[PDB]
């Protein structure tokens, strides 16, 4: 999806709770790549890409994490993920 629109989304819907790609209230599960491939459900099983288990997480929430399907649009979750995806991949947080 679109790393660039997402950028826009995640300062809208995440930066309160991930600013600079960190985790303010659980603060191991980052969203830097080593992290994520720790802790994300499915991606750190081998079983989602990093963008699927990103949108994943987005639409369903996680733990205190709250879920924002029916929150955001269909293309906001899936560029928010490859925003998350981009940033990780290429280390740019
Ligand atoms: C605070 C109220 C949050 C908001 C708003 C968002 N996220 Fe979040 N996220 C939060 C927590 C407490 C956790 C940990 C969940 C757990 O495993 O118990 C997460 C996790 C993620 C992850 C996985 C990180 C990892 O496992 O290392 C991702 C990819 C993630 N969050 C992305 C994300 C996005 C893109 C958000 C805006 C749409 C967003 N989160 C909101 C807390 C909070």
Not at 20 to 48: E, F, Q
């Amino acid at each position: 999806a679109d790393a660039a629109a997402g950028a826009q989304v995640f300062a809208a819907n995440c930066a309160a709770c991930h600013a600079g790609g960190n985790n303010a209230v659980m603060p191991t599960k980052t969203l830097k790549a080593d992290a994520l491939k720790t802790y994300l459900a499915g991606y750190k099983d081998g079983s989602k890409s990093l963008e699927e288990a990103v949108a994943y997480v987005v639409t369903n929430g996680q733990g205190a994490m709250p879920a924002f399907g029916g929150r955001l649009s269909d293309a906001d979750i899936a560029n928010v993920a490859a925003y998350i995806a981009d940033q990780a991949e290429n280390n740019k947080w």
